[PDB]
Amino acid sequence: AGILEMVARGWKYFSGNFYYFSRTPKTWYSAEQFCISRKAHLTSVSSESEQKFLYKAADGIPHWIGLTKAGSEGDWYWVDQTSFNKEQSRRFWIPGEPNNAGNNEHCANIRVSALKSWNDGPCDNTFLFICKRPYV
Amino acid sequence: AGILEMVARGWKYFSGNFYYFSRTPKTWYSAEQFCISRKAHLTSVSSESEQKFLYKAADGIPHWIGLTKAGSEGDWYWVDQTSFNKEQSRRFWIPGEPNNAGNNEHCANIRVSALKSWNDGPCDNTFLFICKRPYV
Amino acid sequence: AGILEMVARGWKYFSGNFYYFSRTPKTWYSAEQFCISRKAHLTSVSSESEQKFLYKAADGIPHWIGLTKAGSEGDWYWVDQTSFNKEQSRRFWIPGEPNNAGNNEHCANIRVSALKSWNDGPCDNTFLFICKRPYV
Ligand SMILES: OC[C@H]1O[C@@H](O)[C@H](O)[C@@H](O)[C@@H]1O
Numbered sequence: 001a002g003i004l005e006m007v008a009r010g011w012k013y014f015s016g017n018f019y020y021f022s023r024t025p026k027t028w029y030s031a032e033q034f035c036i037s038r039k040a041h042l043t044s045v046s047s048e049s050e051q052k053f054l055y056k057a058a059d060g061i062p063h064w065i066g067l068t069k070a071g072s073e074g075d076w077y078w079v080d081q082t083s084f085n086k087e088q089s090r091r092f093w094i095p096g097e098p099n100n101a102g103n104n105e106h107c108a109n110i111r112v113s114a115l116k117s118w119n120d121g122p123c124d125n126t127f128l129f130i131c132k133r134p135y136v
Numbered sequence: 137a138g139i140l141e142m143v144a145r146g147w148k149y150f151s152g153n154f155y156y157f158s159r160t161p162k163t164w165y166s167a168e169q170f171c172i173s174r175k176a177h178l179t180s181v182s183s184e185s186e187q188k189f190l191y192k193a194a195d196g197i198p199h200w201i202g203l204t205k206a207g208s209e210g211d212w213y214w215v216d217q218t219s220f221n222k223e224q225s226r227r228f229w230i231p232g233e234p235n236n237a238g239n240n241e242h243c244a245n246i247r248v249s250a251l252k253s254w255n256d257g258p259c260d261n262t263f264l265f266i267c268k269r270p271y272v
Numbered sequence: 273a274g275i276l277e278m279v280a281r282g283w284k285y286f287s288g289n290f291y292y293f294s295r296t297p298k299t300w301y302s303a304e305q306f307c308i309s310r311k312a313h314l315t316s317v318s319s320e321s322e323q324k325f326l327y328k329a330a331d332g333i334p335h336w337i338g339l340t341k342a343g344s345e346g347d348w349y350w351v352d353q354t355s356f357n358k359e360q361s362r363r364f365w366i367p368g369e370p371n372n373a374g375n376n377e378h379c380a381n382i383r384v385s386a387l388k389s390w391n392d393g394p395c396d397n398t399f400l401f402i403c404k405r406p407y408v
């Protein structure tokens with residue numbers, strides 16, 4: 001269905017995508033499994049515009065997003081398979097991040113309500129999360 | 137008011153009805169009293185289409201619906217007074233349900249995010265709940 | 273942006289204003305600081321119509337509104353700077369209120385889901401809150 005139908009089912013809408021901001025917290029993988037069941041994936045962030053929408057909408061509560069490493073010693077990528085713009089990302093990480101604390105932080109969340117808000121954390125940490133699916 | 141006004145007050149909309157998914161948990165009766173104050177009743181489920189909308193929207197959190205027995209030794213009915221389709225219902229109960237545990241389970245909730253998701257429980261159990269009112 | 277865009281970002285809409293009903297509780301000042309960051313202020317209540325919308329939408333959970341005293345021994349005013357109609361207000365206070373308990377209740381909240389629902393409380397009490405911003 002369309003914008004009205006999705007918005008009237010609880011989805012947010014912004015720049016050609018719908019977003020589901022979860023009620024309850026999950027691990028990164030359990031979140032992604034839930035998003036898949038809603039025909040979605042944990043959100044990518046493919047513009048500063050989208051970053052601004054998302055950090056504002058997350059209300060200062062940490063939220064898992066769809067950035068994860070390709071294995072525990074791998075490079076970051078978006079689980080929805082859109083291209084990961086490394087250089088753009090420096091504008092979105094909290095100062096000092098990603099810092100791979102304990103060598104065990106392989107997923108990312110929007111930690112605070114700021115443009116510089118991404119932190120890497122243990123994927124088994126439980127947070128609210130953001131699903132994204134395209135407006136088609 | 138209309139769809140936009142109801143959606144912009146927090147109501148969901150689907151197939152000619154509005155739905156209010158509660159913030160906080162109540163007993164079955166306290167939920168129904170709240171729904172009445174919002175010109176609604178605890179939701180009926182009168183199609184597989186509606187069941188699908190509701191279990192999806194309930195996000196895997198148990199939610200009271202408007203099915204209750206006519207007294208503690210009575211037959212199931214919908215509190216909004218729409219006809220209860222016994223045979224259709226077998227498609228919506230969790231396997232084993234209704235099981236009338238302790239002979240004291242006289243109200244029903246959508247317990248999980250599946251098509252087979254209804255469980256009978258004690259009406260004094262406190263859960264989130266779903267109000268329904270027609271789009272007129 | 274317009275009604276659809278605001279509603280699709282979580283804002284409620286009623287009689288020419290948008291409203292943000294918070295996820296988490298804050299002190300009165302921390303709430304107001306958050307509302308300002310969302311181009312809003314803690315809500316004023318400038319009609320019985322608006323009072324009805326707000327108490328209904330607050331779902332029986334106490335919510336901070338934008339009424340505060342001009343200093344701890346001052347008169348009530350709306351932080352968004354709309355005129356405070358003293359005489360109208362008597363229709364909206366809970367019976368007995370405002371009672372300035374402990375001589376330390378200098379902010380107001382909608383405490384219950386009724387037309388007579390405002391209570392003065394300590395501004396350092398933590399409640400959910402309501403931001404308002406005009407539809408322009
Ligand atoms: O909460 C303590 C935090 O320290 C930060 O600087 C790290 O980057 C986080 O991953 C860690 O959670």
Ligand SMILES: OC[C@H]1O[C@@H](O)[C@H](O)[C@@H](O)[C@@H]1O
Binds near residue numbers: 233235237257
């Ligand atoms: O949580 C224990 C549960 O056992 C189930 O099989 C019953 O049908 C429920 O009513 C009960 O709550």
Ligand SMILES: OC[C@H]1O[C@@H](O)[C@H](O)[C@@H](O)[C@@H]1O
Binds near residue numbers: 368
């Ligand atoms: O909860 C106890 C309450 O007593 C009321 O009558 C006061 O007006 C409140 O400000 C106070 O919180």
Ligand SMILES: [Ca+2]
Binds near residue numbers: 100119
């Ligand atoms: Ca980190």
Ligand SMILES: [Ca+2]
Binds near residue numbers: 255257
């Ligand atoms: Ca049962």
Ligand SMILES: [Ca+2]
Binds near residue numbers: 369370371373392
């Ligand atoms: Ca008081």
